[PDB]
Amino acid sequence: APSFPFSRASGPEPPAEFAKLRATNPVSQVKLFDGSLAWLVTKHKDVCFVATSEKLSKVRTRQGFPELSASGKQAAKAKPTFVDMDPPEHMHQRSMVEPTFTPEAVKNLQPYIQRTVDDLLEQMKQKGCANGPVDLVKEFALPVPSYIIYTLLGVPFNDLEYLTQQNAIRTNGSSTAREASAANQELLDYLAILVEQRLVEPKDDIISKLCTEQVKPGNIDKSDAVQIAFLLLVAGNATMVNMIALGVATLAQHPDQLAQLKANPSLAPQFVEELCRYHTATALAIKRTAKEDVMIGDKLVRANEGIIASNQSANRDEEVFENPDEFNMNRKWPPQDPLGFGFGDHRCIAEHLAKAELTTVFSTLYQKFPDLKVAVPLGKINYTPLNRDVGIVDLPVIF
Ligand code: HEM
């Protein structure tokens, strides 16, 4: 049984192990850091199965849950939020914050999203270019999702820049454990303040909604509200940043498609669709423990055994996506759902918001800067460590 998680084949590539497993051992056992075993599911059909089976659980206090790291096991001790709940608890809490993320609400947020992107682009533009190349991540990829989620949560405008930086420290590779923990606790303390403030004087934001609709009524307590807000913040911000950076790098890697996108920004949604399939920046979230014996393919997963369903592998499943390793924004999509945002009940609550942010970025970026170019050789891009989800740390660009 090989050690898992695997390491990416290279900067922009997924672990090489998946393709081989999909072809000769679709459901196999892998070894976790603590020596425990878990079943790794690699085929699309099987990942969908794992994502929806009611015989499987997300509760981390269940023996057999596939924790992939030491900190993961320790974090499982805290009171859980809907991300780690099974029905009916899951939807009971998730539904408390769903409203802001529906396709309709996101559609209505479009002008705000566009406005946020335009402003950041305009700033990045005045950030000059005569003084050398600028870092697209620090100047654009990072603040776009950060400002949007912070603003949606209820953070005032003047606090955005500082909080964006602090939340970034939480996951920065350069950050020490101490710095990361401090930023983490700092954000939690700040949200606790906002919750106290919004309880007294609610505004038009998620935190306020939690306070008035759930805290005051006594459905949840203040700390719960804080944890739900924190979850919405940290769950996908880092991923958003990486996806934006990865999209820019990918376009540079395929001049033909960049030319096509420049000539037709209306192709942004298709490009984002292909981007979320090709670069599965969140590939270790579909994990479960078997509540009872379950058969998957030619394997029997016994009660209390853990399962890791790789949506990254599923998105490269040759049986579903033709020429899966080819990035093609003009790709002819099959009826099967790409799994960049998961599947089933737990499917990313912000899938629509995330795609809207990406679509806005890629339909505006090259209209603002038609000659935007990565300022270093593509093969020199600074990707995240290979033992981590795919992403880019920094990306110098000129325009
Ligand atoms: C483009 C970036 C994003 C990608 C690719 C992504 C992908 C995912 C994936 C694969 C999952 C696991 C779904 C499952 O269990 O099947 C997930 C869950 C989740 N994501 Fe994201 N996500 C993104 C952005 C966001 C953003 C912007 C937020 C916050 C505003 C967010 C909040 C969450 C939450 C709270 C969950 C847990 C949902 C649940 O368990 O019910 N995600 N995301």
Swiss-Prot record:
**What catalytic reaction does the record list?**
nitrous oxide + NADP(+) + H2O = 2 nitric oxide + NADPH + H(+); nitrous oxide + NAD(+) + H2O = 2 nitric oxide + NADH + H(+)
User: What is the main EC category here?
Assistant: oxidoreductase
Mutation: residue 71 to A; reported impact is: Decreases the NADPH-dependent activity
Q: Where does heme bind?
A: 348
Q: Which Pfam family, just one, is annotated for this protein?
A: p450
Per the record, what is the consequence of mutating residue 69 to A?
A: Decreases the NADPH-dependent activity
Q: Where is the region Disordered?
A: 1-17
Which cofactor does the UniProt annotation name?
A: heme
Q: What upregulates it? A: By nitrate/nitrite.
Look up the EC number in the record and give it.
1.7.1.14
State what inhibits or activates this protein.
Cyanide, CO, and oxygen strongly inhibit catalytic activity.
GO MF annotations in UniProt: heme binding; iron ion binding; monooxygenase activity; nitric oxide reductase (NAD(P)H) activity; oxidoreductase activity, acting on paired donors, with incorporation or reduction of molecular oxygen
Q: From which residue to which does any coiled coil extend? A: none
- Taxonomic superkingdom: Eukaryota
Keyword list, A-Z: Acetylation, Heme, Iron, Metal-binding, Monooxygenase, NAD, NADP, Oxidoreductase
Its biological purpose: Nitric oxide reductase which is involved in a dissimilatory reduction of nitrite. Acts as a nitric oxide reductase. Is able to reduce nitrate and nitrite to a gaseous form of N(2)O when oxygen supply is limited or discontinued. May function as a detoxification mechanism.
Q: Which family does it belong to?
A: Belongs to the cytochrome P450 family.
**PANTHER family given in the database record:** P450, PUTATIVE (EUROFUNG)-RELATED (PTHR46696:SF6)
* The name this protein goes by in its record: NADP nitrous oxide-forming nitric oxide reductase
Gene source species: Fusarium oxysporum
